[PDB]
Design a protein around this ligand. Structure first.
Ligand SMILES: [Mg+2]
Ligand SMILES: [Zn+2]
Lengths: 60, 76, 167, 114, 81
RNA sequence: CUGGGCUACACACGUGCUACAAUGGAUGGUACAAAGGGUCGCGAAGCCGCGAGGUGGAGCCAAUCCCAUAAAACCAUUCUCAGUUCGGAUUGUAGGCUGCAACUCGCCUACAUGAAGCCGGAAUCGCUAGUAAUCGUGGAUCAGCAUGCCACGGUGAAUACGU
């Protein structure tokens, strides 16, 4: 029961409070970072390749 | 005699319509009203008597505090 | 004195004209009252008995006489001569006075006083009121209030007690 | 003295608190309205404002009714059939907190295993 | 609405409770709105509140007023552990 | 799709928070940081409510404006070794905010109530210097909800013979 859900989230719900967020490369609803709209395990395996501009490993 | 605890006929009035009722009890009632000089018993504070009770003579919706009356005094 | 005044002034001729009695004293009249508490739960407690003693004394104006157990029954570990329950009798002038204090001060304080049906008569006329708490009393468990009348049946008692103003 | 033998040694601000219905804050407004100073020990009152103090408490609720009023409301919802009173009756937390662990003050001291 | 501009009686139940004045409260009202405060007009009517499994009939008294019409139908059934 | 449950409770375990007080509690005055966040956002001034908050709209796409009082520490008065002016759970009432909606099932405010607890057996854990201990601040997630999590600074030790 996933591809049904990713459709629902893109449909406007009856009351505005129901609206919520998911990653796009996945449907994962938990741990989405608002600035990039990506989950916590797309933002990792993707900022390695060098496609999230300006992001790098942080020694300090 | 002697065993019988203290007792005293007293005066009762309804606080809603002054329905005076002459009765008796063992209570002091901590009052003194000169009604019927020579029997100036203490009055006792009471609720609305059966002289004006809804079920008794005149049926009427009366709120006995709180419950249905607390709402009417804040939502309106 | 007010209740006797109303009874002899108006209630007596009212009953007489209702039933067309031969003489004056065939009219039913209130005869006695008995107050029972029934504290049978006092299987071993002692302060319960004494507390009921002052409670009923304050309600009445007389010392109650606690009653010894009629017989020893094992189902309630009841033994012979165990003082269980109390009784107080008001006769003469107390009869109307306690009634008045009940009906004008105590009875109106009943939360949902819808009265008892006419069915609760013994068939002779004597009526028992089963009151549910001691806090209804003006001064301050379940118990019974009986009424003894000179009525030959139940309907006459009903009409006279309604003449007194209560159901 | 005011309903109970409130301590003689304690200052009046503290001493009033022993009344059921007077804490640190209501006691302060009482002594401000009456006029008595806060730091008086009770053994050496004026006994004239003491008559004034009990005059004020006549207005405020005290141990007499507050004991019954709290009980006369807990005994209401336990009869109507509310969930809130159902918890009262069987001895469980009233407000909606959890009971997997850490509910002993309402539930009573922790019984042994079963 | 626990603020100063309440309360919340659902539009579904409020309309049905009003029109039940004709039936002399003989009929029942079956609504799933477990979130409507019992208005003073509700007194005397019966509501068939939902409870997860089946409706449970409640008879609105005078003293029930002020509470939410679902406060009397427990939703988890536990007995004697 | 509505309603319910993941939030149940005889009980057993793990990780944490607040405590049992005088190096302290309560009241009044009072100086000092950094790192952060903000445009379908941050929302000041003034006024009102004891309070949570309401109204109001200034300034800002920000080394410009806002969150934003740092709290411990310091100086005054008071309480006097007590189950208390310690401790704060549990409970009643009356309220505030978000959201179509706070009963199951939210966070917060005031008044009231005011429980166990008086340094904790077997046994077990962390830490070698701006470290342990102690006090506050910010952020993600987020309409709202943290005693968790990730970062930030304020005061700041004892001991290490030896395998
Ligand atoms: Mg959400
Ligand atoms: Zn993803």
């Amino acid at each position: 029961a996933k591809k049904s859900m990713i459709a629902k989230q893109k449909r406007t719900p009856k009351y505005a409070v129901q609206a919520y967020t998911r990653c796009e490369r996945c449907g994962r609803p938990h741990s989405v970072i608002r600035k990039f709209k990506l989950c916590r395990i797309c933002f990792r395996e993707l900022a390695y390749k060098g496609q999230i501009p300006g992001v790098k490993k942080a020694s300090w | 005699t002697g065993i019988h605890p203290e007792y005293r006929p007293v005066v009762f009035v309804d606080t809603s319509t002054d329905f005076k009722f002459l009765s008796g009890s063992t209570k002091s009632s901590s009052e003194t009203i000169k009604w019927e000089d020579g029997n100036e018993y203490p009055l006792l504070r009471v609720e609305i008597s059966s002289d004006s009770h809804p079920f008794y003579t005149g049926k009427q919706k009366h709120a006995t505090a709180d419950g249905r009356v607390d709402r009417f005094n804040k939502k309106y | 004195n007010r209740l006797k005044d109303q009874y002899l002034k108006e209630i007596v001729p009212a009953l007489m004209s209702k039933f067309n009695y031969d003489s004056v004293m065939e009219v039913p009249k209130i005869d006695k009252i008995v107050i029972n508490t029934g504290v049978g739960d006092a299987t071993a407690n002692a302060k319960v008995l004494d507390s009921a003693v002052e409670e009923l004394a304050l309600i009445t104006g007389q010392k109650p006489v606690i009653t010894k157990a009629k017989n020893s029954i094992a189902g309630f570990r009841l033994r012979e001569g165990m003082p269980i329950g109390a009784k107080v009798t008001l006769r003469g002038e107390r009869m109307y006075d306690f009634l008045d204090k009940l009906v004008t001060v105590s009875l109106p304080r009943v939360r949902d006083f819808r009265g008892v049906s006419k069915k609760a008569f013994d068939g002779r006329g004597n009526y028992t009121l089963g009151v549910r708490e001691q806090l209804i009393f003006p001064e301050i468990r379940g118990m019974d209030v009986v009424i003894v009348t000179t009525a030959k049946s139940d309907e006459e008692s009903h009409e006279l007690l309604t003449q007194l103003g209560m159901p | 003295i005011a309903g109970v033998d409130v301590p003689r040694e304690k200052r009046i601000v503290i001493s009033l608190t022993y009344i059921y219905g007077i804490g640190k804050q209501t006691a302060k407004e009482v002594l401000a309205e009456a006029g008595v100073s806060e730091d008086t020990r009770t053994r050496d009152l004026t006994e004239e404002e003491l008559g004034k103090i009990r005059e004020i408490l006549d207005r405020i609720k005290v141990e007499g009714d507050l004991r019954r009023e709290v009980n006369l409301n807990i005994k209401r919802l336990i009869e109507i059939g509310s969930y809130r009173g159902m918890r009262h009756r069987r001895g469980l937390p009233v407000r909606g907190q959890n009971t997997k662990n850490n509910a002993r003050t309402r539930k009573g001291p922790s019984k042994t295993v079963a | 609405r626990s603020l100063k501009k309440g309360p919340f009686v659902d539009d579904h139940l409020m309309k049905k409770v009003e029109a039940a004045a004709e039936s002399e409260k003989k009929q029942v009202i079956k609504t799933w709105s477990r979130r409507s405060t019992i208005f003073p007009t509700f007194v005397g009517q019966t509501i068939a509140v939902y409870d997860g499994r089946k409706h449970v009939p409640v008879y609105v008294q005078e003293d029930m007023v002020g509470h939410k019409l679902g406060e009397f139908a427990p939703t988890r059934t536990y007995r004697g552990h």
